[PDB]
Coordinates of C-alpha atoms and ligand atoms in Angstrom, one line a residue:
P18 CA 117.3 223.8 100.9
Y19 CA 119.7 223.3 103.8
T20 CA 121.0 226.7 103.2
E21 CA 117.6 228.4 103.3
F22 CA 115.8 226.4 106.1
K23 CA 118.4 227.0 108.8
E24 CA 115.7 226.7 111.5
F25 CA 115.7 222.9 110.9
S26 CA 118.4 220.4 111.6
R27 CA 119.8 218.3 108.8
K28 CA 118.0 215.4 110.5
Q29 CA 114.7 217.2 110.2
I30 CA 114.9 218.1 106.6
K31 CA 115.9 214.6 105.6
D32 CA 112.8 213.3 107.5
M33 CA 110.8 215.8 105.4
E34 CA 112.5 214.7 102.2
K35 CA 111.6 211.1 103.2
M36 CA 107.9 212.1 103.7
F37 CA 108.0 214.0 100.5
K38 CA 109.4 211.1 98.5
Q39 CA 107.0 208.7 100.3
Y40 CA 103.9 210.4 99.0
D41 CA 105.1 211.8 95.7
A42 CA 103.8 208.6 94.2
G43 CA 104.4 209.5 90.5
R44 CA 108.0 210.3 91.5
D45 CA 108.0 213.6 89.6
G46 CA 109.5 215.9 92.3
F47 CA 106.1 217.6 93.2
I48 CA 103.1 216.6 95.4
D49 CA 99.9 217.4 93.4
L50 CA 96.4 217.6 94.7
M51 CA 95.7 213.9 94.1
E52 CA 99.0 213.0 95.9
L53 CA 98.1 215.2 98.9
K54 CA 94.7 213.6 99.0
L55 CA 96.2 210.1 99.4
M56 CA 98.8 211.4 101.9
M57 CA 96.1 212.9 104.2
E58 CA 94.2 209.6 103.9
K59 CA 97.3 207.5 104.7
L60 CA 97.9 209.7 107.8
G61 CA 94.4 209.1 109.0
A62 CA 93.2 212.7 108.4
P63 CA 91.5 212.9 105.1
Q64 CA 90.5 216.4 104.1
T65 CA 87.8 217.9 102.0
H66 CA 88.4 218.7 98.4
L67 CA 88.4 222.4 99.1
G68 CA 90.6 221.8 102.1
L69 CA 93.2 220.1 100.0
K70 CA 93.1 223.0 97.6
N71 CA 93.8 225.6 100.3
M72 CA 96.5 223.5 101.7
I73 CA 98.3 223.8 98.4
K74 CA 97.2 227.4 97.9
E75 CA 98.7 228.5 101.2
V76 CA 102.3 227.5 100.4
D77 CA 102.1 227.4 96.6
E78 CA 104.6 230.2 96.0
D79 CA 105.0 229.5 92.3
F80 CA 101.2 229.1 91.6
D81 CA 101.7 225.8 89.7
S82 CA 99.0 224.2 91.9
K83 CA 101.5 221.4 92.8
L84 CA 103.8 221.3 95.8
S85 CA 107.6 221.4 95.3
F86 CA 109.8 220.2 98.0
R87 CA 110.6 223.8 98.7
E88 CA 106.9 224.4 99.3
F89 CA 106.6 221.2 101.4
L90 CA 109.3 222.7 103.6
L91 CA 107.2 225.9 103.8
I92 CA 104.5 223.8 105.5
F93 CA 106.9 223.0 108.2
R94 CA 108.3 226.6 108.3
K95 CA 104.9 228.0 108.6
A96 CA 103.8 225.5 111.3
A97 CA 106.9 225.9 113.5
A98 CA 106.4 229.7 113.3
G99 CA 103.0 229.3 114.7
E100 CA 101.4 230.8 111.6
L101 CA 98.8 228.1 110.7
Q102 CA 95.3 227.6 112.0
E103 CA 94.9 224.6 114.1
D104 CA 92.0 222.8 112.5
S105 CA 93.8 223.6 109.3
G106 CA 94.9 220.7 107.1
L107 CA 98.4 222.1 106.9
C108 CA 98.7 222.1 110.7
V109 CA 97.2 218.6 110.9
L110 CA 99.6 217.4 108.2
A111 CA 102.5 218.7 110.2
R112 CA 101.5 217.4 113.6
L113 CA 100.7 213.9 112.1
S114 CA 104.0 213.7 110.3
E115 CA 106.7 212.6 112.7
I116 CA 108.9 215.6 112.8
Ligands
ZN201 ZN1 104.0 214.0 92.4
ZN202 ZN1 88.2 221.7 93.1
ZN203 ZN1 104.0 225.1 93.7

C-alpha cells in the first residue's frame, strides 16, 4: 500500500491504518457495513442505511460488500482528489477522521 498510494506520507497511511484497525471491531482485516455504521456513529456523523451502502459501493472495487484496507485508502484517495460529493458520507468520514 505504500508503494501504490504515493500521494500520502508514511505518517498519513499509518494514521489510516490506525483508524482502520480502530473500527474493524471483529479484527478480520475488513470493515463491513455494520462496522462502518458504528464508525460513523462514533465519529458523530451517523448515516442512513442506504448511505452506508453507497459509501461501501463507491470504493468496493472487489464487490465483496466489505471494505479492505486498500478500499479504505481509496476513500482518502478519492477525497483528496476532490472526487467525492460534500454531503456524502465518504467525504464526511474523511473530514471527520484526523488526517
Ligand atoms: Zn471487520
Ligand atoms: Zn440494505
Ligand atoms: Zn471490498
